[PDB]
Amino acid sequence: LHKPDVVAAATKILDDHGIADLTMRRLARELDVTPGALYWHFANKQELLGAVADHILRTARTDTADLAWREQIHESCRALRDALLSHTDGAELVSASFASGQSVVITEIVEQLGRAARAAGVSDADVDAAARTVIYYVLGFTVDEQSRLQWDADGTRQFRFGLQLLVDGLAAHG
Q: Which residues bind a second copy (CB under 8 A)?
A: 46, 95-96, 98-101, 126, 129-130, 132-133, 135-141, 143-144, 147-148, 151, 158, 161-162, 164-172
* Nearest distance from C-beta of residue 112 to a second copy, angstroms: 17
| Cα of 154 vs its chain's centroid, Å | 21
Give the residue with the Cβ less far from a second copy, 5 or 144.
Answer: 144
State whether residue 33 is helix, strand or coil.
Answer: coil
Fill in the DSSP letter of residue 42: -
* Nearest distance from C-beta of residue 32 to a second copy, angstroms: 28
Give the residue with the Cβ less far from a second copy, 83 or 170.
Answer: 170
Give the residue with the Cβ less far from a second copy, 12 or 132.
Answer: 132
State whether residue 2 is helix, strand or coil.
Answer: coil
Measured CA to CA in angstroms, residue 63 lies from 1, 8, 40, 79, 117 at distances of 33, 25, 33, 11, 16
* Nearest distance from C-beta of residue 93 to a second copy, angstroms: 13
